[PDB]
């Protein structure tokens, strides 16, 4: 059965001595033992300090209250003594801190009632254990083809993507249209808005959405998004919830900060999570899927069960600007030698490459995309895939566990 921990305690009861540390160790060991067996949800309702912080971290979801919830290992006065930095507890480990900065918190409720509502919402999607199927609501299944059963709410998708590839759109517009009843339970809404992850239903069946968000960082994958998506995917695959990727990724976020903080090592976690995941994995591609991020955002060979693309999809090794600079490097070099209008030549070649290769059809041709579909079809294809892939007869070589990049 699910375990709910309402946490509000400041540290070990130091008078008791080491006994406290032994029972901390036992609580942590039980949380590890239970992890991936039963859903574990923590609500921080006060200042959790000292050892109280690791139990939430080991549980699957963490709810906090906007200003009444704090988590920190060491006291502000300790920090001051050892480093001189002055912080209030709220700055140190308040809900905003652990959402936006540390990314430890999954939700920041406006109040205790909202927190309880959120936990009941989570439990509505989550099965009681890994041997149980997620709570499946009966639904009025429509009958006929996708073409025959498109709603106008589906047809709204046909016009959603802006004509200019450089203008973003809010991916919630897609998520709330493909999901049942427009109802989406976003997880870590505040942490890494370049990836939107959360729960919903399709035909009454729980699904985990993971989607790029063009409005922040052009939808790049960064370290924080990669870890958010990895742990959300692994939670879903622990609890049998099938996952839908909505992909619009130009690549990874460039920079020395990302490199020195390990975008390689910590982005590889999303690869691991996706490849390990044995639940149903459906990918819808909307505009971009370039380079390594094409592999990370659920490519076919990563074992995407159903991969579909909208006609606006752009599946390529790299954007045309750079691709021209590699594919035509020699020709451009000759034009530079001869004193041609090398810039006009670049523009013409770039147009040519855009018109030739930067489309879905090349990948459909290779069969990496199963179908290029009218956007309105998306909900039909997703529902069909999830209805068929209830049980996947798939396996990996026997192991004690993965050695996930860590």
């Amino acid at each position: 059965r699910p375990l709910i921990g309402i946490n509000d305690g400041a540290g070990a009861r130091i008078q008791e001595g080491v006994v406290s540390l032994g029972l901390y160790s036992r609580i942590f060991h039980n949380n590890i033992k239970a992890s991936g067996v039963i859903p574990q949800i923590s609500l921080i309702m006060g200042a959790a300090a000292g050892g109280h912080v690791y139990s939430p971290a080991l549980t699957d979801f963490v709810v906090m209250v906007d200003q009444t919830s704090q988590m920190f290992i060491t006291g502000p006065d300790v920090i001051k003594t050892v480093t001189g930095e002055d912080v209030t507890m709220e700055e140190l480990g308040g809900a905003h801190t652990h959402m936006a900065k540390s990314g430890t918190a999954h939700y920041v409720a406006s109040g205790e009632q909202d927190a309880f509502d959120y936990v009941r919402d989570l439990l509505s999607y989550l099965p009681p254990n890994n041997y149980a199927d997620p709570p499946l609501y009966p639904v009025a299944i429509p009958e006929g083809s996708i073409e025959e059963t498109l709603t106008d709410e589906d047809l709204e998708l046909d016009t959603l993507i802006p004509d200019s590839p450089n203008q973003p759109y809010d991916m919630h517009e897609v998520i709330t249209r493909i999901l049942d009843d427009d109802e989406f339970l976003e997880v870590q809404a505040g942490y890494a808005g370049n990836i939107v992850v959360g729960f919903g239903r399709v035909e009454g069946r729980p699904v985990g959405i993971v989607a790029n968000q063009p409005t922040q960082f052009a939808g790049c994958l960064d370290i924080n998004a990669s870890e958010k998506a990895a742990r959300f995917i692994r939670t879903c695959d622990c609890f049998n919830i099938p996952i839908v990727l909505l992909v619009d990724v130009p690549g990874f976020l460039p920079g020395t900060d990302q490199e020195y903080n390990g975008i390689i090592r910590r982005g590889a976690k999303l690869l691991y999570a996706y490849g390990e995941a044995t639940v149903a994995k459906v990918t819808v591609i909307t505009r971009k899927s370039y380079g390594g991020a094409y592999c990370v955002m659920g490519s076919k060979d990563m074992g995407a069960d159903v991969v579909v693309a909208w006609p606006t999809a752009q599946i390529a090794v790299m954007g045309a600007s750079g691709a021209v600079g590699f594919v035509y490097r020699q020709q451009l070099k000759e034009a530079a030698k001869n004193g041609e209008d090398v810039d006009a030549l670049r523009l013409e070649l770039q147009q040519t490459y855009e018109d030739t290769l930067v489309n879905p059809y090349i990948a459909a041709e290779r069969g990496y995309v199963d179908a290029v579909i009218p956007p309105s079809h998306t909900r039909g294809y997703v529902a069909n895939a999830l209805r068929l892939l209830e049980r996947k007869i798939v396996q990996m070589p026997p192991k004690k566990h993965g050695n996930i990049p860590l």
């Binding site: 254990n129 041997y131 199927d133 709570p135 499946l136 049980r391």
Partner: protein, 61 residues
């Protein structure tokens, strides 16, 4: 219509008696394999029931 209906084999009611009859008759008328017994049974390492009972339980839908 191939539905199976009620059938008044004998006699005729008046409409009021039929209404009483039908009102009375109408007024009278997720997997969780956790700890399934098949997991609790002790099997030989080579016991065929590992196929024909255990898998045929866990896999079956």
């Amino acid at each position: 219509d191939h539905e199976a209906h009620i059938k008044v084999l004998r006699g005729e009611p008046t409409p009021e008696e039929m209404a009483a009859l039908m009102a009375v008759l109408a007024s009278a008328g997720e997997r969780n394999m956790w700890g399934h017994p098949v997991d609790k049974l002790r099997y030989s390492v080579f016991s065929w029931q590992r196929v024909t009972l255990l898998e045929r339980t866990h896999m079956r839908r």
